[PDB]
Amino acid sequence: AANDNNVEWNGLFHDQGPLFDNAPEPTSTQSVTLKLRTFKGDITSANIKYWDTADNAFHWVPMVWDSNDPTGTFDYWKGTIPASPSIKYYRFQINDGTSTAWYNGNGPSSTEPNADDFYIIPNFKTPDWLKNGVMYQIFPDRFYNGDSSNDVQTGSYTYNGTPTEKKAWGSSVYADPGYDNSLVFFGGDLAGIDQKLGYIKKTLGANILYLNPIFKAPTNHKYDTQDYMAVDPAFGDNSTLQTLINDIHSTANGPKGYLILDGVFNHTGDSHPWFDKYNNFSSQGAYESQSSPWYNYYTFYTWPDSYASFLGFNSLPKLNYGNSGSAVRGVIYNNSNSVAKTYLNPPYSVDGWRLDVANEVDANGNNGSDVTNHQIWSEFRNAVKGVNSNAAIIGEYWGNANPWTAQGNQWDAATNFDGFTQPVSEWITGKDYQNNSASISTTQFDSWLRGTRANYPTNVQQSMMNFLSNHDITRFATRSGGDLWKTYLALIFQMTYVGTPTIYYGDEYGMQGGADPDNRRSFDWSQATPSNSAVALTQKLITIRNQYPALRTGSFMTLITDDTNKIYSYGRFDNVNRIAVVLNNDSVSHTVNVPVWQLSMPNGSTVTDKITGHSYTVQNGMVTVAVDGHYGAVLAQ
């Protein structure tokens, strides 16, 4: 490069990883020093342009040359945004004589962008264990039956007229005639999770457990809460939960573990005593009496039979959050004995909440995504973080969750349907996550990923819950048509991408399943061994991620987007390590010249492919690696 009236886009880089930003989670008193990479000698001037929410105006910080990289290929220019409490957004203007380029969260642009600026959110922290962890999601009825004495039997009880049905382990999940899919039980429980912690924490190596709902409720899914303050008897009692938590937290059985519970706060079940539609309690619920102590916890259009409910399901009456200081806000999060605080305080001390349909939570029967919804989650954050600043808050939302994350006042992160599950599904399987036809190329995949990362502050990106499948979509292995190699590829991407890798129980061995309820099959402990190739790969990949901070909190740089050969390569890198991931999404093998010079891997240095164990030497800026179809290499130094 030279001063030639031309900014060379391929040399440009910035993100908020360690090489480029000295304070990615600054306080009010920490200034933010930013570095912008260019090719050596490429430019004449560069400027940081930042919007300051303190004065609703743009501010200009000229950059200065700072240094070269060790290979002598690049310059770094630097400038500092001053310390203050205010949220700020920034982009770069980059000039080489008569050539100008702009650069922000969406990368380079010839014209000045008006969206996707980088974020500075003073005093906003997401928990570092969440950024650095690997999560395992368990739907508790279907994982392991550690105690047969608590099992729901066929006809143990009835709910809204229908008796319960028990199934043998391994059998089909669908309800036989006279029964209901929501009242089918296999007997999985908290004792079972506890007894299989070795598998989770050592055989795989995941350090975060996320459970679907575990509180008293009549269904197998337990989103229709009857008692938030009791573990459902089928799963155990509150002492069983305490034991499970102690064993998760223990460092004597593997790494220190964390537990995230499913917080179902938009609605209760119709059998909750506050509502009590079937008269299961001597108290008078809102359905039973307009003088009920809890009458104003719900919203009636025509009392008693027409009320606000989740997706119009009469079994899920919607909670009325009212105004600040309301009794409902009290019982859910403000009170010390609230649902949220009870489990965060001793003697439970759980590590976070996954917020079910969190966008819907509101007052007056409204459907959220509004001022009141956001106010509620701001209060919720204060409540949660006041008890435990390292308790995680992850909201369920299927789109761009910017409105609940990018002011640093609400969630730490969200369920990454839009930025992970969907684009991974369409790239690898040619299906959307509901198993309908929707395919994207590699260039499209890369673009989709970048634009969705740019929706979020960096700490939030790093804390996103990144799952291949979950309890509300079709299984990845069904979308893949049973091709185990498509799972291998998906796992390698998952374990080296930005955000918390989250394994939906059984995805690590290739479990199949269509729509709900078929995405909740029981777990096979024989198929759950290193003899299954996907399980062995998962263990290896978790070990790799845990070895390299660059994979969890490093920069992300696209290296190759090859639509001909279906090769995607990207780098993860920080001050210590440089890692080039090379993915082959074709059905045939390809030999790839990986441009590791882009990560400043020096000529003559070596990398190891952590997938196979083979070593390679860097020559003329390149590493040449052969990659099987639907597979990948993780070239680390």
Contact residues for Ca ion (CB under 5 A)?
1, 4, 6, 42, 96, 145, 147, 150-151, 187, 189, 276, 279, 281
Indicate if the alpha-carbon torsion angle 385, 137, 374, 300 is positive or negative.
negative
C-alpha 192/C-alpha 229 separation (Å) is 21
Q: What number of H helices and E strands is found in the chain?
A: 14, 33
| Alpha helices in 22-151, H assignment, sequence order | 128-132
* Whether the Cβ atoms of residue 181 and residue 172 lie closer than 8 Å to each other: no
Identify which of residues 293 and 322 has a Cβ nearer to Ca ion in the complex: 293
* Whether the Cβ atoms of residue 360 and residue 377 lie closer than 8 Å to each other: no
C-alpha 242/C-alpha 507 separation (Å) is 27
Name the β-bridge partners of 79. Answer: 34
- First vs last Cα of the chain: how many Å apart? 27
Q: List residues forming the annotated binding site.
A: 2, 4, 6, 42, 96, 145, 147, 150-151, 187, 189, 267, 276, 280-281, 283, 288, 354, 471-472, 516, 520
Percentages helix, strand, coil for the chain, rounded to the nearest 5? 25, 25, 50
Identify which of residues 168 and 252 has a Cβ nearer to Ca ion in the complex: 168
Query: How far from 607 is each of 5, 80, 230, 410, 636, CA to CA, in Å?
Result: 37, 34, 52, 41, 5
C-alpha 547/C-alpha 460 separation (Å) is 22
CB of 19 to Ca ion, least distance (A): 22
| Degrees, nearest 5: CA angle 622-12-1 | 75
* Whether the Cβ atoms of residue 150 and residue 189 lie closer than 8 Å to each other: yes
C-alpha 141/C-alpha 543 separation (Å) is 28
C-alpha 2/C-alpha 74 separation (Å) is 12
Identify which of residues 44 and 447 has a Cβ nearer to Ca ion in the complex: 44
Q: List residues forming the annotated binding site for Ca(2+).
A: 2, 4, 6, 42, 96, 145, 147, 150-151, 187, 189, 276, 280-281, 283, 288
CB of 11 to Ca ion, least distance (A): 9
Of the listed 117, 356, 412, 574, which one is catalytic? 356
Identify which of residues 276 and 609 has a Cβ nearer to Ca ion in the complex: 276
C-alpha 176/C-alpha 206 separation (Å) is 36
- Backbone phi, then psi, for 228, in 5-degree steps? -65, -25
CB of 252 to Ca ion, least distance (A): 25
CB of 164 to Ca ion, least distance (A): 13
CB of 191 to Ca ion, least distance (A): 7
Identify which of residues 293 and 602 has a Cβ nearer to Ca ion in the complex: 293
> Token pair 């031309």 is at which residue?
6
* Whether the Cβ atoms of residue 306 and residue 300 lie closer than 8 Å to each other: yes
Number of CB atoms found within 10 A of residue 296's CB: 15
Tokens of 420: 């992970």
Identify which of residues 6 and 335 has a Cβ nearer to Ca ion in the complex: 6
CB of 539 to Ca ion, least distance (A): 27
Identify which of residues 214 and 592 has a Cβ nearer to Ca ion in the complex: 214
356 an active-site residue? yes
C-alpha 201/C-alpha 528 separation (Å) is 14
In eight-state DSSP terms, residue 432 is -
CB of 414 to Ca ion, least distance (A): 32
Residue nearest to Ca ion (CB): 187
CB of 102 to Ca ion, least distance (A): 16
Identify which of residues 46 and 392 has a Cβ nearer to Ca ion in the complex: 46
Torsion of CA 546, 552, 558, 564, to 10 degrees: 50
Tokens of 577: 């390590």
CB of 236 to Ca ion, least distance (A): 8
Identify which of residues 6 and 195 has a Cβ nearer to Ca ion in the complex: 6
Of the listed 8, 117, 396, 507, which one is catalytic? 396
Can you tell me whether residue 340 is helix, strand or coil? helix
Q: Note the maximum CA span of the chain.
A: 84
Q: List residues forming the annotated binding site for substrate.
A: 267, 354, 471-472, 516, 520
C-alpha 315/C-alpha 252 separation (Å) is 43
Identify which of residues 524 and 562 has a Cβ nearer to Ca ion in the complex: 524
CB of 272 to Ca ion, least distance (A): 11
Tokens of 315: 């079994």
Tokens of 512: 């199949």
Query: How far from 331 is each of 228, 261, 328, 429, 478, CA to CA, in Å?
Result: 10, 17, 5, 44, 41
In eight-state DSSP terms, residue 92 is E
Active site residues: 356, 396
